[PDB]
């Protein structure tokens, strides 16, 4: 039992107090969707038609201010829906809403069962013209949560 | 119609309700129906509310006079509510036409009972008289609680239960037992 | 064959000792972002 | 449970939203 | 294909900021110039 | 076409490339269900 | 969290798997004190606790609940596996 | 409902028996009576089509914050025959002192 | 970073190739967070000297 | 002997006595609370927790997997299971029952070796027997090797036997590293300066000092207590880059 | 973010299985399994057949069994 | 007496069974 | 509430009077 | 040791929670 | 008068005793 | 209490009384 | 979990670790005895 914890190297403290380290995530990560709303605001159910079917804009409630003025996101097909989003987040109280279209030259429209609650969307890019470009995009970041220990 | 025992069993397990109909000459088409139980979270004045505690068919259990009579021990930790800190509300249905002769006033189908556990009380009760041991000076709590159970008496057995769960919820909910 | 949670990710709006490591700790129980 | 007349009409009320005529076919 | 992105402000974190929360059983300063890059 | 070359004496089920034996009956596997000899 | 259970106070839960020999393979969810208390549960409130010999529990696994929403635990015992 | 009616012709009835007698009410009892009878009429019209029973249970629980607030209002009375602590009339009929394997035994 | 060490310096020279030296300097790289000695002050304290 | 077994009980054998509620009900002789910190095997349990009665291969390996998925180098998946005496024959013949299932395969004498030619005296071409399996290889670099520790079969404070015959802490396997951490994961928390205070009281005569006369009497009897004692605790930084799996008649 | 709920549900041609997800009307507790579960490129392969909260004052009982027998498959 | 939704979708509903 | 069969019955003897 | 008809009742009432008829066999 | 639990227990142990 | 045998009696006495 | 990897057909019982063939009945060692399939 003696030889096993010398098979551990040792610390040296100053108190003997508590001590505390800090662990900590990825900067990188996809949020679920709660709602979906059409160009008039009223909700997709898995029973209906397409909904961005002329490159017609839509909305996407999403749980946390997350996603950016210009970019592009993605439902859990990626790359077949892109979603380019329009204006910043409209705050239904703690929810943000964006005005979103389609991007890869979608003409039929995302169908109604890619819209539901629980999809993850996560940041792709954010394109711009290459003539008089205004700002898009924004960058996330990522915090400590901490242990702890005593004597 | 009226109640036999209503009471939540003493091993705080079991919520007893025994149903009878009333003897009387004029009751005898009438029987029990259905057995529906609410808490101070669903209830609703008008009626047992939707999306009901546990809901209880009367037919299912027996294959005339059975149907006057009924009663059941439903284990509390199945219905997934804590026995403590519950108010179970208890509806009873008739299913049944009485005679023509029937006095004005007697033909209520419907019923309802109040359930609580007397068990927190008792205790609390204990707790006090022991403070009281000391000094012999009277808490000004145990006035207070005594007369915030009066205030719930005199609300149920007025009808007026939603300001009963009001004071419930407000002054007894946190309960040791 | 089934997952169990190990870790959670939220955000910031759904919210001195002495230190035993100076650095940060990188959880197993956590995805890494993939460059 | 007893019913009176504004019971009944409201119900009425309710149902007439649902239904159409023969001519709205 | 043309990019552009912005960070409206330097070493501090700023309003989108997530936390990574792990389940155990018994339950610095952000440098801006290299998130961007 | 398919040979088997094993034969397990077990309460639980076997590799699908062994033949079953169980307390006096033989099942074999075949085309994703256990087929029994009898 | 101090509800009155046994370990400290604070309520448990289990994913528990396992073979019953010669029937087949299963899931189990539970709260327990202990991870004995957990597998004396399968043995006592099981499916198959009349012939409680055939029980080989392989896994009891601790679920901690989380801060906000979301799929906690999972379990699939496919027939392929069977 | 057909209660709501009563207690609002109830509780203007006193509020001009009040001005009778007197020649002054509070208005902050006015204003009760004022959302007295603006429910009165919203939940008696066409306008109680919109109402499910969780806005039922709502307005229920905001009303009986008017129960005992003033004169005019007062608490409403229901047909009750129950209690906290119920009787216990059961009787016990035990049959040829028989005792069962643990428990006793009656008819 | 979270996988790295100082690279075994018990080697004979044939062993510290160029991957070996590249290696040492990489782990250099991830300790310039880092300012801590014995007879030293910190950064901040001589830059608010300074 | 004594304070070497003291202090490697308490730093290896932890129960940190903090409530729910961050309280501290264990209160010393003098009214001050009996604060203790968690050891080396309790700071281990609190993420990787596993239980079983019957080993299976298969939970070991997909979980070994699960957690180090995308996020170990091929090189860098070797675990390395602490084990019993006994744990490593329930490791045997599971591994046993495992190469049983590889029908498409068939395992000859001239590789396994199972079955080696001896010389003796008694036969021309005599033979001997034995074998034991102690690696799995898994799919995708994932390795596992047996490390037969004595320390987890020390029968003084190990009391529950195991049915198959040991005590019952043989059975526990331990995956003490997962790959490298770039910091000890794993360190044994000492002060820097407590030293522990060696304190004798004593009256005129001192046997362990071995002074006769003394000018500062304590008291007046012929007495000589010693009184030691030592602050410590242990850190394991990252409890998810170690993975348990225990025997559930130790009941957690 | 209230309650806790523990599932049993049914893969349908595949086999059977047991689950637990936080939420706060059981409802959700499908969509947190029928999105997040293992079966997401599938999710219609789904069919739920008890939920149930955990009630915590027994805090020692089973709140899901689903065993597969030999003869299902 | 009182009517929320939830009774006139019973009602209704029921009526459309026996019909 | 909860509309036991006879008030059905009830409704539906009202409604196919005017009928 | 007298006992009055209420004391009967108590007994009667603890003794009925313990016993139960052929029908609940 | 006044009974308590034990007294209960003792005269329904003895009901039972002779039963 | 201490309940003696004729107690007892009474209390078995009073029990068949309804037997 | 017991491999009856040959099969021999014998009039007498061949082993243990061999599956016994006699004219209308295949029989192997189970319970410390001969029980026959089918």
């Known amino acids: 039992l003696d030889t096993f914890l010398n098979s551990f190297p040792t610390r040296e403290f100053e108190d003997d107090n508590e001590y505390y380290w800090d662990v900590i995530g990825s900067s990188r990560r996809n949020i679920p969707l709660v709602e ?17 079917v002329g490159t017609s804009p839509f909305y996407l409630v999403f749980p946390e201010d997350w996603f950016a003025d210009g970019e592009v996101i993605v439902g859990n097909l990626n790359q077949v829906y892109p979603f380019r989003i329009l204006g910043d987040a409209r705050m239904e109280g703690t929810n943000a809403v964006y005005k979103v279209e389609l991007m890869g030259g979608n003409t039929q429209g995302v169908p109604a069962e890619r819209l539901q609650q629980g999809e993850r969307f996560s940041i792709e890019f954010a394109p711009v013209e290459k003539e008089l470009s205004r700002k898009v995009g924004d960058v996330r970041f990522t915090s400590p949560v901490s242990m702890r220990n005593e004597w | 119609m ?176 | 064959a089934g997952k169990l949670g190990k870790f959670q990710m939220l955000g910031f709006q759904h919210w001195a000792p002495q230190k035993a490591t100076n650095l940060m700790v990188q959880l197993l129980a956590f995805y890494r972002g993939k460059s | 449970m007893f019913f009176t007349q504004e019971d009944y009409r409201k119900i009425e009320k309710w149902l007439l939203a649902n239904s159409r005529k023969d001519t709205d076919f | 294909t043309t990019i552009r992105i912005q960070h409206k402000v330097g070493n501090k974190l700023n309003k989108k900021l997530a936390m990574g929360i792990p389940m155990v059983r018994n339950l610095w300063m952000h440098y801006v110039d290299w998130e961007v890059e | 076409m398919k040979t088997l070359r094993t034969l397990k004496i077990s309460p639980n089920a076997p590799d699908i490339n062994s033949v079953w034996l169980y307390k006096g009956t033989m099942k074999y596997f075949n085309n994703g269900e256990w087929e029994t000899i009898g | 969290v101090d509800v009155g259970c046994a370990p400290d ?49 392989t896994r009891i696994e601790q679920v901690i609940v989380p801060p906000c929403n979301g799929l906690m635990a999972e379990q699939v015992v496919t027939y392929k596996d069977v | 409902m057909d209660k709501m009616l009563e207690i609002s012709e109830e509780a203007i009835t006193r509020y001009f028996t009040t001005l009778s007698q007197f020649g002054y009410k509070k208005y902050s009892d006015v204003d009760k009576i004022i959302v007295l009878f603006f429910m009165e009429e919203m939940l008696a019209g066409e306008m109680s089509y919109y109402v499910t029973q969780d806005d039922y249970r709502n307005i229920v629980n905001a009303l009986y914050c008017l129960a005992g607030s003033t004169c005019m209002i007062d608490f409403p009375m229901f047909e009750s025959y129950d209690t906290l602590v119920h009787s216990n009339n059961r009787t016990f009929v035990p049959r040829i002192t028989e005792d069962s394997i643990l428990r006793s035994t009656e008819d | 970073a979270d996988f790295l060490n100082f690279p075994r310096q018990m080697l004979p020279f044939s062993k510290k190739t160029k991957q070996w030296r590249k290696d040492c300097l990489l782990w250099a790289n991830q300790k310039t967070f880092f300012n801590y000695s014995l007879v030293r002050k910190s950064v901040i304290h001589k830059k608010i000297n300074y | 002997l004594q304070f070497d077994e003291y202090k490697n009980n308490a730093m290896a054998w932890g129960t940190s006595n903090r409530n729910l509620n961050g309280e501290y009900m264990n209160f010393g002789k003098s009214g001050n609370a009996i604060k203790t910190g968690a050891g080396i095997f309790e700071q281990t349990e609190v993420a990787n927790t596993m239980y079983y009665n019957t080993f299976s291969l298969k939970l070991l390996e997909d979980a070994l997997y699960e957690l180090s998925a995308s996020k170990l180098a091929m090189d860098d998946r070797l675990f390395v299971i602490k084990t019993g005496e006994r744990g490593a024959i329930q490791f045997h013949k ?46 995708n670099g994932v390795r596992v090797r047996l490390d037969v520790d004595p320390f987890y079969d020390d029968p003084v404070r190990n009391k529950i036997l195991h049915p198959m015959g040991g005590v019952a802490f043989s059975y526990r396997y331990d995956i003490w590293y997962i790959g490298t951490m770039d910091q000890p994961n794993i360190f044994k928390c000492k002060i820097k300066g407590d030293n522990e205070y060696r304190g004798y009281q004593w009256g005129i005569r001192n046997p362990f000092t071995g002074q006769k006369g003394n000018p500062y009497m304590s008291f007046d009897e012929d007495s000589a207590v010693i009184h030691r004692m030592a602050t410590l605790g242990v850190c394991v930084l990252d409890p998810t880059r170690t993975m348990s799996l225990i025997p559930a008649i130790l009941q957690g």
């Open chain 10, 94 to 139: 599971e591994v046993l029952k495992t190469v049983s299932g590889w029908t498409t395969f068939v395992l000859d004498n001239n590789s396994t070796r199972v079955v080696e030619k001896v010389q003796s005296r008694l036969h021309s071409n005599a033979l001997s027997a034995g074998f034991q399996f102690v690696e799995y290889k898994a799919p």
């Open chain 2, 2 to 177: 009226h109640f036999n025992e209503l009471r939540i069993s003493q091993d705080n397990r079991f919520l007893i309700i025994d149903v009878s109909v009333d003897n009387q000459d004029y009751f005898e088409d009438v029987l029990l129906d259905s057995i529906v139980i609410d808490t101070q979270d669903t209830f609703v004045m008008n009626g047992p509310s939707d999306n009901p505690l546990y809901i209880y068919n009367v037919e299912d259990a027996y294959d005339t006079q059975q149907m006057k009579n009924v009663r059941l021990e439903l284990n509390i930790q199945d219905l997934k509510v804590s026995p403590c800190s519950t108010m179970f509300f208890v509806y009873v249905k008739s299913k049944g036409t009485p005679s023509t002769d029937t006095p004005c006033g007697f033909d209520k189908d419907q019923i309802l009972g109040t359930v609580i556990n007397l068990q927190p009380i008792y205790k609390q009760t204990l707790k006090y008289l022991k403070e009281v041991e000391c000094d012999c000076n009277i808490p000004k709590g145990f006035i207070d609680m005594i007369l915030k159970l009066k205030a719930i008496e005199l609300c149920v057995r007025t009808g007026n239960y939603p300001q009963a769960i009001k004071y419930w919820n407000k002054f007894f909910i946190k309960n040791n037992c």
């Open chain 7, 9 to 57: 106070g604070a309520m448990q839960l289990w994913v528990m798997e396992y073979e019953v020999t010669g029937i087949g393979k299963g899931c189990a969810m539970c709260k327990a004190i202990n991870p004995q208390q957990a597998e004396m549960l399968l043995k006592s409130n099981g499916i198959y606790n009349g012939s409680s010999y055939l029980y080989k529990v």
């Open chain 1, 36 to 52: 979906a709303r059409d160009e008039n605001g009223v909700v997709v159910a898995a029973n209906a038609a397409n909904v961005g």
